[PDB]
Structures are given as C-alpha cells and as structure tokens.
C-alpha cells in the first residue's frame, strides 16, 4: 500500500520484485508481439474500393461501416457488443481514464490496488484498420499480398483458385457462381443470427 514501513521490510527479500516485474513486462511485450504477428502481417494498408460489386458476393457485414464512428463491420459490431468488455486503457478525461460500457467498471477499483491495465499498442481502431487492410488484400489481391507485392485479381478468379486448391475443378465455380454467392450470403446471415 501507501507505506514505507512495509517497503523497508519488503526490499529485504531481494530482487523478487525485479523478477516479477520482468516477467510481467515480458508478458506484456509478448502480447504486443502476439497482436503484431496475428494482424500486422503486412506493412501496406489497403483502401477498400468505393464500388463494392464482387460478382454477387456480399461483404457488407464484414467490410467496415462508414457510418459507424469506429468504422467497424456489423459482424464486428455484434462481436464487440456480445463480449463482456473489459477496459482498454483509454482516456476520456473522466478521472478514471476510460468509460467502461456498463459491464466491468470494477477495473477502476482494480486500479486502486497498486495496479493498472495497460492499453494495447494497437488501439481497437487501428486493429480494425489492420483487419480491414487484410480483408481488402484478400478480396482484391488474393493470397499474393502475403508473399510480396499485392497483385489485384477479381474475386470470382480468386474463388476459382480456391476451388482448384481443394481438388474441385474451378469451372464448377463459374457454373454456379450465383448459387455460391447466395449460399455465402445466407451463411453469413445465419452466422449473425447464431452469434446474436
């Protein structure tokens, strides 16, 4: 606590605090490494094209929403609301830094006990930006953006490639392109319904 009397006895036990703090700092930098390795697999941010016709496929629930303040996708919005949010280390001049959304405000209490939660190096806004860049590369470039320069390709062509990659002749994909698009849209809708 706020006591030097205990601290004098505390330092007698050695560099145990040094080890504990080093372990926690390693854990935190490892979390940063985890986020960077999962999301920051590219160093170019790709802009989603304005016209979003992709051969009948519908990515509205996964592409970013321009009207949303945070530009999160509807599916990402569902995932954001459903999960019981913790704190993210934000600050809104509230005294308690960030405003937790009526779920786990007790983090403020956890702040008082000589402890805090550190914000991620990538904010959820720029994490979503990385995710949007990955999605735009996948939709536009395919797999090529991960092995060097991004090489644009129409989405039905990438679907033909993915068909060929599982031992199914890609011509089938073009003979039932509309069926595949409809099944994908329905499956995304059912994903939303199941998650909600």
């Amino acid at each position: 606590g706020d006591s030097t009397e205990c601290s004098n006895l505390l330092l007698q036990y050695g560099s145990f605090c040094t080890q504990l703090k080093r372990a926690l700092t390693g854990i935190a930098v490892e979390q940063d490494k985890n986020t960077q390795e999962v999301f920051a697999q590219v160093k170019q941010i790709y802009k989603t094209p304005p016209i979003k016709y992709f051969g009948g496929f519908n990515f509205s629930q996964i592409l970013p929403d321009p009207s949303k303040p945070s530009k999160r996708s509807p599916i990402e919005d569902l995932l954001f609301n459903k999960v019981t949010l913790a704190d993210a280390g934000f600050i809104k001049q509230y005294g308690d830094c960030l405003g937790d959304i009526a779920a786990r405000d007790l983090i403020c209490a956890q702040k008082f006990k000589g402890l805090t939660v550190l914000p991620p190096l990538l904010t959820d806004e720029m994490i979503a930006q990385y995710t949007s860049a990955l999605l735009a590369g996948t939709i536009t470039s395919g797999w090529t953006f991960g092995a060097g320069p991004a090489l644009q390709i129409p989405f039905p062509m990438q679907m033909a490639y993915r068909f060929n990659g599982i031992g199914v002749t890609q011509n089938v994909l073009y003979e039932n392109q509309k069926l595949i698009a409809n099944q994908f849209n329905s499956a995304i809708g059912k994903i939303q319904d199941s998650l909600s």
Binding site: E5, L9, Q31, Q41, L134, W143, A147, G165
Partner: protein
C-alpha cells in the same frame, strides 16, 4: 513487524502464484496466437491443404 512479515509472505506468495498462472495461461495464449498467426498465413493469406 512479525505480523507484517507474515502478511508480506502471504501476499507475495499470492502474487507469485498469480504471476505463474499468468505465465502458464500466457504460454497457452501464445500457443493459440501462434496457431492464429499460422491460420492467418495459411487460411487468410493462402489456402491450407
């Protein structure tokens, strides 16, 4: 001083156990995150056979 020493030992053991369980579940999270990076590379950045 004796009672504070006892409480320090108890809280230090609690913190040490917390840090070790965080290390274990952080190794678990790191395995899951290496799996997630592998899935990003082979499922999102490519097609995995």
């Amino acid at each position: 001083e004796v009672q504070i020493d006892r409480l320090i030992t108890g809280r230090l053991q609690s913190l040490q156990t917390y840090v070790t369980q965080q290390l274990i579940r952080a190794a678990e999270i790191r395995a899951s995150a290496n799996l997630a990076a592998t899935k990003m590379s082979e499922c999102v950045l490519g097609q995995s056979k």
